[PDB]
Each structure stands twice: as structure tokens, then as C-alpha cells.
RNA sequence: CGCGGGGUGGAGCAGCUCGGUAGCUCGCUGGGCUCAUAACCCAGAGGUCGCAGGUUCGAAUCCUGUCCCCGCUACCA
RNA sequence: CGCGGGUAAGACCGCGUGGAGGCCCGAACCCACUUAGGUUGAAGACUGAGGGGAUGAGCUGUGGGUAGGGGUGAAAGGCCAA
RNA sequence: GAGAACCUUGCCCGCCGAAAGACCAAGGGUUCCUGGGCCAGGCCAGUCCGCCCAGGGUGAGUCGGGACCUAAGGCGAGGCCGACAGGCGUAGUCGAUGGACAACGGGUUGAUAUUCCCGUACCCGUGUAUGUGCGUCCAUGAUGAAUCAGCGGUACUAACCAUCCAAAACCACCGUGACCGCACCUUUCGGGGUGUGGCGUUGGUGGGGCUGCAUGGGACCUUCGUUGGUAGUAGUCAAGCGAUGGGGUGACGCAGGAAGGUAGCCGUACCGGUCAGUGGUAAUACCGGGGUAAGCCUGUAGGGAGUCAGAUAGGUAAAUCCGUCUGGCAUAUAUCCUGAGAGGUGAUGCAUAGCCGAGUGAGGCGAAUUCGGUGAUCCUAUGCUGCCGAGAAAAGCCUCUAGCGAGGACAUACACGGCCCGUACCCCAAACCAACACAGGUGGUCAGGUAGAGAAUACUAAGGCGUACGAGUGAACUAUGGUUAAGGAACUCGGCAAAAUGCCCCCGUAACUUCGGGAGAAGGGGGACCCACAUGGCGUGUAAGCCUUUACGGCCCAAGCGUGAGUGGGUGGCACAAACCAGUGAGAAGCGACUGUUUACUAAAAACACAGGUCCGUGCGAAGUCGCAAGACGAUGUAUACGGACUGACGCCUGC
RNA sequence: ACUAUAACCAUCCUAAGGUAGCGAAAUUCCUUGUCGGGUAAGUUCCGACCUGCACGAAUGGCGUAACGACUUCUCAACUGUCUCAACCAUAGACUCGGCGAAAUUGCACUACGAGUAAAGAUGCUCGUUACGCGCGGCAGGACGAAAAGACCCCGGGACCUUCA
RNA sequence: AUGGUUUGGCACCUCGAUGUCGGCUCGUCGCAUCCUGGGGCUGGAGCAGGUCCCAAGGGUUGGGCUGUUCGCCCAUUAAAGC
RNA sequence: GGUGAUGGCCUACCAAGGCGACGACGGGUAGCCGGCCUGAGAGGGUGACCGGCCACACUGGGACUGAGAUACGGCCCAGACUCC
RNA sequence: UAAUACGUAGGGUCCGAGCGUUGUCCGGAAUUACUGGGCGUAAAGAGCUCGUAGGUGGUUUGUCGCGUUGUUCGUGAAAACUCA
RNA sequence: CGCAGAUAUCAGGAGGAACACCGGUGGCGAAGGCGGGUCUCUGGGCAGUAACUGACGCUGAGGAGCGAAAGCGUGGGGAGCGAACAGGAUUAGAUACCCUGGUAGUCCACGCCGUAAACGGUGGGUACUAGGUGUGGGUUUCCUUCCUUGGGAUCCGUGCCGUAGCUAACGCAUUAAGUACCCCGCCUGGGGAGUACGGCCGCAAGGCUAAAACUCAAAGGAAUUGACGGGGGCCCGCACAAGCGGCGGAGC
RNA sequence: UGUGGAGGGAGCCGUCGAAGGUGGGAUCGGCGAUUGGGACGAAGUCGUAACAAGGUAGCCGUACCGGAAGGUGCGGCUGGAUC
RNA sequence: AGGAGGUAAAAAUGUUCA
């Protein structure tokens, strides 16, 4: 859930934090911990490509198994539920009965001791991973592959889920969290249930420093930049831009999806706005 | 420092010069409906955007002084 | 968190423990608000006196990266070897 | 000395003393030391010098680095991409600011010292010798295994049974492709219409034997598995090293105390010594000392950890290792590990206050060295607790087997090798960056005392400076400080600047409030010294006592040491937070919510950011961005995410 | 129905005609608006009115506790800020010794008045005044020094914007 | 008609620099005299004035508001000069 | 200790209690009663004369004297007012 | 414009050294209802429950005698009121 | 809205909300209120038995809880409906009725709010006082078909009617507004005003508590008679309709 | 026998102490530019909300909107007419 | 006796004492 801080400081007035309640262990599993280093939003050239990134608390990568293909029929038990800074969701440490230890996305309803099944002959329970050919319609799923073997791409964030609407042929229709309906090969695998830590959205981070810890550098508005820096720049006194809204590189608002894409035929219905 | 700008029946608005300026709504007058307004009928009536000048025959109409409430008047050092 | 009160159980109240905080005062440290001086300076941007922050969006060392219509910029058109 | 304010010596005085002391790094590069010099330099002079000349000087297995490890990042075989140039990047290889790794004390020189010497250690390697001593070949065991037939289950399919289905199938029905009878009606008749008997059942309907399809149950041979011994033989294993591989560790944040300790400091037993020409003070006073490391022992406080057996392939192969699962056994002042520190040893040494003469400085002798107290920002501690923002890798070490394997392990003694670079000197500065011997800047380590909360501030020790133009002189004037009658903002754009407030403990504290604050609100009172309460209380803790598992045990505890706080009484002064240090406060409005950021060098702000909000985009090598492209960031993320725009806590709202 | 305004109405145009709330505002020219408060006296400040030159709802509106080296106003205390200035010391200034620059500089035994003049004269005219040379001081002039005026214009650039 | 202080007109020196308003300080000058002084006329009874003439010796306040000059106001003054 | 006398009446110490919705503490008003007026009575209102009690004597405070003191025509102080 | 309601006259009436008015209190007012009210629509049933304090309490035996009741004593000053 | 292929029709899909018929003077609940089905958990009631305790009861100031709808917050969702809003229409004007759309909201989760014609405008408990008639739940019993919602007796409910009694009347009338007891809440003329000030609660909206000045001589309740109705029913009239002829326009 | 000694007093000091002063609050009123609503008023303006189905039945609560009555939505009541 | 639903669109006001 959520712990609302008390207003002992102005940087804590309306602030909130997670009550790390479904979490059981403060420490991660060392074998599954790869290192990480910040980039600063900078690429191989050393140049800012994505702005508003840097500083940030040090982090370490928990090796998640988004590709749960090699443990079919080999059950596991959720040994722990842990915090992952790399993602909004929490992560569940599973002990496979063959001795393999792995991390997953920690769906809702999942606790220590819950037994996780993988494969076609698995039960339709939270945390169980199956092909969509074996998952029935109207089911709530997460961590879906876009391609067989490609690994889970979809419905990975906290509180989020995908609704499997139907299967017609070798294509399963999926209502996505954005509302977009799209087709995906039934061979693609999905984890049953909805992702946990859905309370995450309702956190008030209270102060600038907290997002500086999360690695979000300050976002400056164009209207207070100079015209050399931003199209919206300039003006004596405040301005609304002096023109229609654009990016700092002058690209206007509007659809940036490349047309004539391969996914256009798999997509059934783009998401909706305003309604 | 300096520049600018439409006027028309009682009110509000239209109408650019083949030779008239007028038309709409409201208002007003007379009648009717009602026991007595509004809505109906009109014989309905109603004005020279003020004078000067046109090439004027004649200009509300075009041009200048005036006709004058007019949006913008702004010398930035 | 504990104790006590209270309750049907609570919410809640009090006492303690506990030691949070872009919390307070204030040295180092970092800044640079005011003022005086300097203004052929002691100094190509300082001194003195006060001043602000001072566990944090902190300061700092070492090493490294981004390069010119480009970088970087909590955005002043500021900085990129006076 | 030719020459002296400046050089040398001595004595005074003064300054710093979280530094103006001591040590490093970076940087500089010989500036270090000795000797000599003095036309340049030094803001004067100069006998001096960081200046000039010459000569000398930097000694490491353990320090800091390489030979060990990797991070960011860089180069980058091949490679990909790119018109060429080249951009990226894999494997790799570099790359500390980090990881790992063995040393401490004292002495010495004119200059070096964890480097040399002395003493005592430690870490790698090497050879020889010796001894315990397992092993191979001998022997020894642990051993377990392929053949056959007997039996329980695969049940080729010969088929057996059940369930389901109709390929075709008898009967009657609905009306019939058209026609063949009976019957009735219609444009004037014609080309038509209605009920039904047969034909075809175009098709559909309801009961039915049969047969043929599919599924399941059993199940011959075929075939899998347990006994029957040839064959506990062919075979394996049993020293040790063991990985370039597997696994574990290495391996990590921030804050916060508390506890135990130590250094350090203050005293003190004890030792040695002075009389510092003053009124008193000979021991009763005063001064000085009142030390000694690593390492080896020990293994305390604190902290941490279940163990044994079996099974298992998950860890590219194998694993006795790691995981995982099963059980059994334990909840232990048990065991193990870690570990400050105490104590012992190191140390019959070394060092020292001082004493002897010697006086350039060569030496020589050398006392006591107990008790407490206080007390760290250091150690235990990479701990413990808590929290979220969720906190490097690799080597190394350990282990596993694969593998190697006939010699090998361990111990002792002796003898040996331990490489390269740095090491002088300055290092908050006169030696670095600053054009200067520049009031600037420069990261880290030591952190004495008395007061004090304190690393502030004052004074001071050790130690180091008086830092390089001076001597004078009551001018104005300027600067910096100081004081000021009466008044008290009248000054002035403006209370600018100054002044004031300022500490501790008590009391008491408003509007408003987001209930946290406002608030140190405001506004007041006390504060010194002496005595007594007080041989008190508190802390500590000795002796003594008590208990015990007997030890580095515990409890208590006279004394001793330290130490407040308060009450009462008294004393003195103008004054008691006496100096230094050290909030001014209140009301109201505007702006911005706030902490922060900003125009290095005239603007710190109402500007930026901020959390929060809305909109838009993005379905994922996304969108967006750097790039010609590859590729990269985004993101090792996946719409509760990411990017862009505007707004900018919060409240009421956000109309056309 | 006194007056005043105008709840109300008519008409024209519009895509729609500014709602809530605010309002001489960081926005109000007129303007020191008017009224009130505070003051002895207040172009500032506070409150209020609304005749909004030219507020206005995320270029957010109206408020807001707390915060602010912000801005504005007031008050207490405090004071040399002032009435109104005096005194002391120190560092300079001054003197002696020593070293020893600088910007600047067409010259020079470089007066004042009233004039004249490229219209503001040390330098010209007519007069007046003035022994020569220094030292400390003040800063009225030398249109003083410095910087080939940044304002203005002309010419040319640069960067920025855009339905060039 | 004076004067040359206002707003201006001209654009004559100065754009290889003539620094601007207001205040502070220091003043100096003129008189077109605010006070003080002398006087004429008066619709000057007296007090007090009005107007004109002569007169520039001296004096000509402190505050609130405003950057302000100016102005308004407060108290005063012999007067609160231009 | 003090009183004439009991008692926090006062004091040192000790304990932490005491009062409050049955209205504490506060605010307002008021001298109380016998009685008076009204009213069928209950009740309501009132507190003049007369009589009893209390309180006060310019305001506030204080004691002294005395058997006895709010000591009107007594004292002390302070304050306001009036007068020399 | 025909006033028994105004003003005046007569006349009448109620009081009578008084008469009227005003003010205040009670009554009437069963209009805060104890005696002595009410709450469907007149004002009035809490939106409904739970339940604290409180109020209230079925049948019965015994007891206490608190309430209650009887009696007596003392007091209830005098004056008042009432009776004579 | 369509003519860019709407409406309509067929098929498929998505999603939301509400649950036709059953379903009513019916049932349950303290009230609010509760209606698709199933499961789970759970509360209350009624009858019978009379085994148990043995007056433990009733009410309940304050207080606490529950408390329709709207509304508020946060987060989802959002088909239909739909304040506001926008057009259209009507209208003298129409910020409305009507139409077309349509936002919040209605929905879910957690919480605030705490009101309503929250009404039976009727507080709770108990006892008694004529009956009739329906209906719901349960117990029994008698004709017996031994069929049996055939009837009766009784307890609990819920309705209609009707006595006595009560009531101003309307009406209530064994589900009292009767007869009586206990307890609570509330009233004391209408306005001002359930408003201000203060306080409490609340994010807010607002709620709760709750006046005074001033003002009126009434406000009110029930019922009667009339009148009236853009209420109804029945009936008439040159009233309309069907016709004929005129007036209004000319002159007099 | 003596300016003797208890003892007492003046004076002085101290506690308490009125008045006074300082301070910050509480509480009760009055005024207050402007401003809100309430009551009354001949005869004024705008509309017609309610009473008859008052011409959209009204009213309760809530919310929103609107010159004003008021309108609309949600839920509720009948103190609602016709059949 | 037995048995669906309807339509009238809008259309205001009324000085005096009474």
C-alpha cells in the first residue's frame, strides 16, 4: 500500500512512500545481480540523447527471467519478494525444484510459498507462465512476448495487465494497458495475473531531491529558453511559445509512429484519446 | 515634434454615384382582438449625413474646408 | 515499537523508547546578500566587517566523457582555458 | 665584516598555535647539504638568501606504484557500417581515484631513512640435508556390474468385450421433375387453379436386425523390468597436485546512536632536583620525569553461524562443491568463527628526566616508571539497529570435480634469491596554479592545555615565525578601529552603515495554521565568590566482602578520583552569560509555495527548478535524440513506463 | 412616482462577446482618482469603491500556513544616520635616508575681466593685476586623462524571428 | 518692447567622448526685493494694508509624501524671495 | 507556629490528591429574611416604612487600643478631590 | 357633509377631595399547565438504533423503619396576616 | 445524423449499467433501504418444546454507530441517462417546459458528508377495551374426501372496514390518535431566523448548537357555503359547424 | 557604682504587602470608510414562480445554472388533479 | 360485460376605497 508521510518538513508535507509490505527481504540474491552504471542520458558519442537523466542512486540489475521457456513442468516456489530499483514492480525470487534460482515480476496476490508452474499443462494461476494457446480468453495476463522466444515485452510495469480477448487462429487478440488491441502469435508466452505494486502510481514524491535520487534531472521549459535554444523561446515577459507547440527540435505535436510498419497489420485498434 | 476617422426616418442599422435617397427592425399614429397590453391590419405617416464645389444636368453617393462622438497619437534617446 | 488508559475490538489519548528530516542554530567546507576599502589594486574581480547554506537537489579529490552552429546549460544567450 | 636596522649568537618582547605547527599527494625539479661568492636578482642595503659557482646528496622483498585485479572510460584483432577520409564495436588489452598483498620500535649523517645500522618479526620463492610420512608397481581392501532362463507388464496384432456412429438397409408418412384417373372454378374459349390414388422419393420425417467406422478395458508373440551364477572377473577407486571450467566468498548504501575499549590528556605513588637576591616560603612549596612498538602467545567484551544423512542433475561436461527437496538430531552461558582490547612476551634490550667533565660538540653514567580519573570525531565495526533512494567489478581466497599423477605432502635445520620506478627538498607555499619572493587559490593526514557545547573564540604549550624598505612626526585629508553630552531616524531614495539583541537554566508565550508549525514568538526572573546541607547525591571503582560454571568470571563496594544541580546563609563590586564569543524583535501587504539554482567579472530576484497537475506522443532494436549509415542512449526499461509541451505545493475553481 | 443610475428593452455585428473571482492592481494614462485608516503633516503603505486607458481563470484566476540575504509600509528598542560635530590611536599622507615607476606629453617665462573668435580663449583685442623659485593642500578650468561615443544617424556585419 | 529662465525653431563648436535629473557640500553674481530700511499716492481715521518708487548690506527655518525639481501639507518665522 | 477557639489559618516536609454534567471554574445581576402586593390556591413578583442579620463609612490596604472594632463623627500609609 | 367613537354644548354616568394618565408587578393567561396544557394535519416525535449516567420496577416471605404516617417536646423572635 | 453509404436488416465482437416476466395493498430489515443466478460468510425474527437462569427488565440525557439521493477526495471505469453547457424550436422575451446533443455525475474500490415530505408528517415498552374481512409465516385440531390452501383454535405479522371511546374536525379505532403506567425528545404567536455572533464538526459544500433588536394583530388547522379552474361528467342556446345575407372599405 | 547587666525602644535589614509601573493576552461594548441582508411603505419598474392539472403538479434534501421570481438533474413525499 | 394507449404546443397582467 502507501505510507503518507507526516508534514514535519515542507519537503515531506504531502509526500508518500510505499509500505514495502509484500517485500520480505532487503537484500538481493547475489548470483543474479549484475552491475549497472548510469549513463546520464548519454550515448556512445557521449552526447545527451535523452534529456533529464543523471545523478541518481547507484543501482544493480536483478536478472529477471522474461523468457520462461526452459523450466516447463519444473515447478518453483516463491522464496522471496524483493525490491527492484530498475522497475516499478517488485520481483519474486523463485526456487525451482531443480535448484535453479530466478527472478520474476512479482504479480499481484503472490506471496512466499506460492507454487509457480510453467508450461502448457500449468494451472491458470497468478505467476504461472504459459503459452497463449493454453491460456483461455478473458484472462488477465502480464509479461507477454511479442514474438516466440523474444522474451516478455508487454505488461511489465506495476499494477498493469493485459486482457486476452480471443484466439481465432495462430493469433491471439490482446487488449493492452493503453487500450490498444493487437494480435500476437499464440506461441508467445504470458505470465498469468496482473503485476503488483499497483499502489506505485499514487506515490507523491514530495520533493525534488527524491526524483534526483531516482535519476530525473530538472526539466526546463522552452518558453523561458532563448529562441536559439528552443522554438518557444524568447519574448519580453512570459510567453506561451509564440507559435504552436513543438519539441526543442521543432517537431510539432502529432503522430510519430512510422506508417507502413510491419506491426500495422497485427494492430487492430490504436488506443483512444479524449473519450 | 506630428499623424488619424463614421455619420442616413424618433432609436439602431443597411444602401456608392446607369440621372433621386432611401429601405429593414424597433418606435409612433389610426383601426381591430380583449372588460383593458403584447400578437394582427394597415389609407399607414415619418429624414436634405449641414453648408461649399463637381465634368455636375444632377448628385446621400464624387472632391475638397466644414460635416465631427471616431479606433489608432506612439518621438522611443 | 512498548507500556498504560479506553474499547466489545477499536479509532483515539497520555507516557516513554526511537532518532526521521532537501528540519533548526552554528565551525570547517561551499557560496557570495549588503556595506566600506581597493579601483596605474596586495589582486586582470579581491580584502575587511557582517551575511546564506552547512546530511544534502550537499561539498570535494582522482580519473574519464560530451567540441563549435556543436557541446553543456535547475535556462542567465550563461559557460566551453582571464 | 671594507661596509650591518636587516646576517650570526645570546637575552628580552611580541605573533600563530584546527596554525602562520608537523607529514603527504598533485605540481615543481635540485630549489636540499657543505664550502665559497656578492656589480645581476631580493621592491632599500646585504657579510645573508629559495640568487651565482663547485662538489656532494635520494639506498626499500614489507612504504607509494609496476610485475596482481578490475570500474568509468579509452585503444580495439577479426568484424559491421561508411563514396574515400573514417564511425562504432566484439574478443581482448589497458585504465585507480578502489580491491588484494608481508614490518615494526629505536639510533645515526651535513644532507637519506618503515629504505642504512641495531633489535625483533613477517611474506614470497629456491636448493641441500634430516625426520615423520602416505602412495603407487607387490599386497590390501570398498567394491559394484553385461549373458541366459523362471516370473510381472509392453499386448506385435490373431483377434475378445463394452460404448458411440450409420455404408446400405424393411415399413408408413409430407407433398410430388413431369405424367397417368376422379372431382370443382376462372379472361368469351384459349396458354391456368384445388384435394387426392400410383409413378421418382427432387429431399425430409418416425421404429427396426444386420453389417462396416472410431474410442476405451483386457491381452498371445514381440518386448521392458525383478531373481538364478558362471562373473566381489573382466573393471573402477584408495598418495598428491588440481583447473584458464562450476560454485561460494570477495561484494560494498545512507543515517543513527548505545555499549565496551584504547590512544590522548589531567593527576598521583615513586624518582631526581631548585631556592629563581621581593613580605612569606626548606620541603609541608615549586620544577622535571613518572616511557617503550610491530610480531608471537592468549582469545575476553561485542558480533555472527544450526548440524548429520539421503536424494537430485539445475550450475555448457562431471562433481562428494553449490543450489533445491526430503527426513533425523538440536535449541544448547553447546560448538565454531570473528574480534577490539586487557595481561604476558617482545624488552637483562631500547629510550629518558637528570649527573660527569667536555665544550667545536665528542662522548660516558643513568633514578623511579605505581595507582586512579577523564576520554575520543579512533578501534570492535565491511558490526548492530532503522530506512529507502535499495547501494561496483575482477582478481585473490576457499571448494568442487574434469584432468595430471609416480612419486608426493608435511615438519625441522642450514644455506640462498627477492626484480623495476619513486624516495633529496618546498608542498595553504618565497619552491605548485597565479607574469612578481603577488593579501588570491590548492585535496588529504595528525588535532596538546586551560576556559568553553565545540575543530568556535581568548590565552598558551610543543613547534615555528617577527615575511625582507626603514627612522621619525600630535598637520589637513583619507582609511581602519574606539568614545561621546542632550535628543534619538529629525539623516536618508531607503534606518545604508553603525548601534542594539546575543549564552545557560527556570517561567511564559498571540493571531493564524496544511495541526507539523508560528516559537528561541513575544515578554520576563536568576547567574559571581565563600561557607554550610555535604564524610552528602551521581559516576567510576580499588581494598574488603559475597557468589560461581574458576576464569581475561560476576555482584556489591569503604577508600581514592572526578562531578554536578539545588536550598539556606553570608561577602564584594557600578557591573557576576562580567573579557572574547554570542538571535534584534513585532505587525501588515505584494511576489514566489517551500529547501535549492542562476547572469565566473555590475542583476540572487518576483526569474529557473521543484513536487503536484493536464495535454500530446510512444505497442517496443518504441517514440524522441546523436549519427550519412551501422550503432548507441532511451532501457538491460515496456503505457502505474518513456519522451515532449504548458502549468507549478496546498485549498476553491479552471467559464464561452 | 425627486434626481440619479438602470434590474428591463430595442437594434447591429460576432465563432463567441470575459463567467466565477479579482480590481487605481508588480497591470490605472487621466492620477497624488475618491473615501476611510495610520501620521502634526503620508504622490509611498493598508482597507474599500469600480469610471478595468489596457485583470482574468493551467501564457492558470482568487487565496494560502510555513519559508525568503526579495520588494513595500509601520512600530518598539537602539544608536554620531542626523541636529552637529569633537577627541584618541593606528595605516598612509608629511619629514630624513635608500631603491625608484606610471598614465600623459605639439609647444611654453601656460594670469584675470569684458569682449572677439569654429558662436564657452593661458595663448587674439582693450585694459586690470602680477617680484623669481619651491613645499603642503583643494579640485573651478585646461571643453582635463582613459576608451577612433555604446545613445542618434549613415554604411557594413553578425545573430534571432517569420504567413519575406 | 525688455529679458533669454520655459516649450520650441536652427543644427554653428564638440560623436578618435563636452557625463544626465534630483539631492549633498561649497559658494558667487544680478535685482525683476520675501523680510529688514527709506519714501510718494490711497476709496490711508488708527492697527493692518493696497499700489508705485529707491534700496541687493545682511538674513531668507525644520519636517511628512514623492527619485523627484516643482507642488501639497504640517509647525514656525521678521521673512520662509526670484 | 498561630488563635479566644477547631482548621492550610500559616510554615517545612511528606503523599497526590480534591471539585466537576447532581453543572465545577467563569460571566451577569443582586444585600438576605420576617414580611409586602397579587392570586381561589399553588404559585408569581417584590425586599419601601417597621423589625432582625449582614456589609460598608471618600477609594484601597493595614493594624493599634481595648472585654468587644467594617473602629461613620479614631490612628497609619498610599491615591483622587477640596481648602490653608 | 346626514360622526351616539373627533371638537364643543347640553344631558347622563362612574368616582368624589379626589379624579384620570403614565410607569412597575400579579391577575385575568389552563399563555411554561405541580395543582393545571400539549405534540398525525394547528408550534411541537430527534432520521433510526445501540447504550452510559439517571429515572422507573413482575409475584412473594421476613426484617430495617430511610421515605411515609401518627403523637409528643423544643424551635418557628416581635411586628405582620387571621379570629375574638 | 446521412447520401464519404445513414436508417433498416443479418452475423460477429467490445464494454458498461440495470436485472423484464416471477413481483403484489406480498416478504425482510431499527431506519436508510433490499429484487438476475450460484457459492461463501453472516445478522435478525417467528412458532413449538417447555430443559435452563431467575426481574437479569423498560426507557435513555449526553455519547457512539448506522444513515436515501445529491455532493467532496483519491484511484479506476464510463454503455445508457444526464445537472451544467451548446445549438434548434416555442416565446413579446425564454438564461425554461419540447427537440438535438452533451460534461460532471450516476457505476466500482476506499473514505469523507451526515442531511430529506429521512412521512404513518403518529418516539419506545407494557396491559386492557366489540367484531367483521383479506393476506403472509408457523403450530395444532375436527369433518374426513381420510383427496386436501375443507374448516376451526392459537402465536407472530401486514392491510381494508367498522363499534365503544377519543378528536376542532378530518379522521384514529386491538398495527389507537381510545383507556392507563414508565422513560425520553420536542412545543409555547407569525415574521426576523433555524439567520447573525461565538463555538464544534467538515477538504469543501455546508451541517449542529443557537439568539436579539425590530416588526404584525395576526400567522395558522379542519371543515362549510359559494365563485372559479387552460379539472371531469351530462345537457342546452344562431354558440360553433353547414348555409344565406351583411358590417368593417365609398358617399350620405 | 556605672555612662554596668538583663530587658525595652528608636533606627536599619528581611518576608508579606496596597497603590503605581512594565508587558502580553482574555473578555465586554461603542465608532468605522465601505458592505450584507431583514422589516414597512403610496403608486414605481421587470416579469408570473405558487394557489384550480395555476397552464411543465407541487414540495423536501442536495447540486448546478440563471436578471428575478425560478429552471434542471438525482432520490424521495403526497400536503397531487383526471381517468 | 372479456380484453393496447392516447391527445388539448405557448398564450401574461389587472392603480384607488372595495
| Nearest nucleotide from residue A59 CA, by C1' atom | D391
Which residue do the cell numbers 514492480 mark? Answer: A89
Residue A163, CB, less than 7 Å from strand I?
yes
Set of cell numbers at residue A259: 506508417
Residue A211, CB, less than 7 Å from strand I?
no
Set of cell numbers at residue A274: 479524449
Residue A47, CB, less than 7 Å from strand C?
yes
Task: Determine the distance between A201 (CA) and D654 (C1') in angstroms.
Answer: 25
Set of cell numbers at residue A221: 521549459
Instruction: Determine the longest span between alpha carbons in chain A, in angstroms.
Output: 70
Of A81, A87, A73, A68, which Cα lies nearest the Cα of A107?
A81
From residue A228, how far is each of A168, A187, A222, A223, A249 by CA, in Å?
54, 52, 10, 12, 11
Residue A222, CB, less than 7 Å from strand D?
yes
Which helix (H) or strand (E) segment is A213 a member of? helix A208-213
Q: Which residues contact A250 (CB under 8 A, 6 or more apart)?
A: A231
Q: Which residues contact A203 (CB under 8 A, 6 or more apart)?
A: A2, A16, A17, A18
From residue A137, how far is each of A93, A140, A167, A172, A233 by CA, in Å?
28, 9, 7, 9, 52
Pairing assessment for the beta strands A171-175 and A115-116 based on DSSP bridges: unpaired
Q: Within 13 Å and on the Cβ side, how many CA atoms surround A268?
A: 15
Experimental technique of record: cryo-EM
| Nearest nucleotide from residue A228 CA, by C1' atom | E160
In angstroms, this model's resolution equals 2.8
Of A224, A249, A228, which Cα lies nearest the Cα of A236?
A224
CB-count burial class (<10 Å; 0-12, 13-18, 19+) for A133: middle
Count of residues for chain A?
275
> From CA A245, how far away is CA A229, in angstroms rounded?
15
Of A64, A47, A76, which Cα lies nearest the Cα of A104?
A64
Q: Return chain A residues 197..216 having CB < 7 Å to nucleic acid strand D.
A: 197-201, 203-211, 213-214, 216
> From CA A153, how far away is CA A76, in angstroms rounded?
22
> Phi and psi dihedrals of A129, rounded to 5?
-110, 130
Pairing assessment for the beta strands A60-62 and A33-35 based on DSSP bridges: antiparallel
Three-state DSSP at A199 gives helix
Amino acid at each position: 500500500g502507501i505510507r503518507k508521510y507526516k508534514p514535519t518538513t515542507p519537503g515531506r508535507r504531502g509526500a508518500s512512500v510505499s509500505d514495502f509490505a509484500e517485500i520480505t527481504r532487503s537484500t538481493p540474491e547475489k548470483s543474479l545481480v549484475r552491475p549497472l552504471h548510469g549513463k546520464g542520458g548519454r550515448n556512445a558519442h557521449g552526447r545527451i540523447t535523452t534529456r533529464h537523466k543523471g545523478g541518481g542512486h547507484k543501482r544493480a540489475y536483478r536478472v529477471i527471467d522474461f523468457r520462461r521457456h526452459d523450466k516447463d513442468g519444473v515447478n518453483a516456489k516463491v522464496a522471496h519478494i524483493e525490491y527492484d530499483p530498475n522497475r516499478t514492480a517488485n520481483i519474486a525470487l523463485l526456487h525451482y525444484l531443480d535448484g535453479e534460482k530466478r527472478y520474476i515480476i512479482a504479480p499481484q496476490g503472490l506471496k512466499q510459498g506460492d507454487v509457480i508452474e510453467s508450461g502448457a499443462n500449468a494451472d491458470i494461476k497468478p505467476g504461472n507462465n504459459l503459452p497463449l494457446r493454453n491460456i483461455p480468453a478473458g484472462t488477465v495476463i502480464h509479461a507477454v512476448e511479442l514474438r516466440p522466444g523474444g522474451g516478455a515485452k508487454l505488461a511489465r510495469s506495476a499494477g498493469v495487465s493485459i486482457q486476452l480477448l480471443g484466439k481465432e487462429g495462430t493469433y491471439a487478440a490482446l487488449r493492452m494497458p493503453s487500450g490498444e488491441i493487437r494480435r500476437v502469435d499464440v506461441r508467445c508466452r504470458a505470465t498469468v495475473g496482473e503485476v503488483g505494486n499497483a499502489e506505485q502510481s499514487n506515490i507523491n514524491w514530495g520533493k525534488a531531491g527524491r526524483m534526483r535520487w531516482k535519476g530525473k534531472r530538472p526539466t526546463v521549459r522552452g518558453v523561458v529558453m532563448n529562441p536559439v535554444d528552443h522554438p518557444h523561446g524568447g519574448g519580453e515577459g512570459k510567453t506561451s511559445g509564440g507559435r504552436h507547440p513543438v519539441s526543442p527540435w521543432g517537431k510539432p505535436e502529432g503522430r510519430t509512429r512510422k506508417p507502413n510498419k510491419p506491426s500495422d497489420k497485427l494492430i487492430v485498434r490504436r488506443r483512444r484519446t479524449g473519450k
